[PDB]
């Protein structure tokens, strides 16, 4: 309905997204920004205020200097697998690092969208001050925490279910209505947050 909002958010994101040195698909990198541009501007401006940089990567996560301490480190609940932090495409929290071309579900992650799920962690931690670990959201998580699948992951950690609910809410119209169907209280919760 509104293309003007996307364009203004893209300009906010221009003060947030940092493009990598090296070779990558420029069009796909731009597609990731367009998807991030659907997040409420209130959240984006607040990330801009706190100087949160969304770093897009052309290579592996642990190839980057700041995440080199993760090289060879096995993430939690990567029992066997054979994969370490070197094989993780995205990361969110205090910092945001995303590998370009790995947005879709299955590209080394179970999130419905890499960049929206990770940026959610930053908005949760930096902007909303760990709202996923608040009494109100815990009550909702207690009831709706498994309604998006991944019951041993999303259904166990409220910070993860928040991030995925956020991604469902802001990705596209289909996954938004999917969230409203499966998680009415969570949908209502996020809707009030942006009011
Ligand atoms: Zn996560």
3-state secondary structure the chain: CCHHHHHHHHHHHCCCEECCCCCCCHHHHHHHHHHHCCCCHHHHHHHHHCCCCEEEECCCHHHCHHHHHHCCCCCCCCCCCCCCHHHCCEECCCCEEEECCCCECCCCCCCCEHHHHHHHHHHHHHHCCCHHHCHHHHHHHHHHCCCCCCCCCCCCCHHHHHHHHHHHHHCCHHHHHHHHHHCHHHHHHHHHHCC
Give 93 Cα–ligand 1 centroid separation in angstroms. 9
Question: Resolution in angstroms, to 1 decimal, for this deposition?
Answer: 2.6
Cα 85 from chain centroid (whole Å): 17
Q: Where do the structural domains in the chain lie, given as residue ranges?
A: 1-195
Q: How was this structure determined?
A: X-ray
Contact, 62 vs 25, CB < 8 A?
A: no
Nearest residue to 90 (alpha-carbon basis) of 54, 126, 129, 66: 54
Give 119 Cα–ligand 1 centroid separation in angstroms. 9
The strand pair at 96-99 and 17-18 is best described as unpaired
What's the rounded Cα separation, in Å, for the pair 114 and 31?
12
Two tokens at 104?
């879709």
The residue whose two tokens read 């897009």 is 56
Give 160 Cα–ligand 1 centroid separation in angstroms. 5
The residue whose two tokens read 């608040």 is 134
Nearest residue to 170 (alpha-carbon basis) of 124, 112, 128: 112
Rg (CA), the chain: 16
Nearest residue to 95 (alpha-carbon basis) of 53, 45, 132, 42: 53
Give 161 Cα–ligand 1 centroid separation in angstroms. 8
Give 7 Cα–ligand 1 centroid separation in angstroms. 27
For 182, list phi and psi in degrees, rounded to 5.
-75, -40
Give 22 Cα–ligand 1 centroid separation in angstroms. 26
What's the rounded Cα separation, in Å, for the pair 35 and 22?
22
């Amino acid at each position: 309905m509104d293309s003007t909002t996307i364009q203004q958010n893209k300009d906010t994101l221009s003060q947030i997204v940092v493009f990598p040195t090296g070779n990558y698909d420029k069009n796909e990198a731009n597609a990731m920004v367009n998807r991030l541009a659907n997040i409420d501007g209130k959240y984006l401006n607040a990330l801009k205020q706190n100087n949160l940089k969304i770093k897009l990567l052309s290579g592996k996560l642990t190839d980057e200097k700041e995440y080199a301490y993760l090289k060879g480190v096995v993430p939690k609940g990567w029992e066997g697998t054979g994969k370490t932090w070197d094989d993780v495409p995205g990361l969110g929290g205090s910092t945001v690092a995303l590998r370009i071309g790995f947005s879709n579900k299955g590209k080394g992650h179970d999130a419905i969208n890499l960049e929206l799920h990770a940026t959610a962690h930053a908005i949760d931690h930096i902007v909303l001050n760990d709202i996923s670990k608040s009494a109100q959201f815990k009550q909702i998580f207690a009831k709706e925490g498994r309604s998006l699948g991944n019951v041993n992951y999303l259904g166990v950690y409220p910070e993860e279910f928040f991030a995925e609910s956020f991604a469902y809410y802001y990705l596209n119209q289909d996954t938004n209505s999917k969230l409203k169907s499966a998680c009415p209280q969570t949908y209502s919760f996020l809707q009030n947050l942006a009011k």
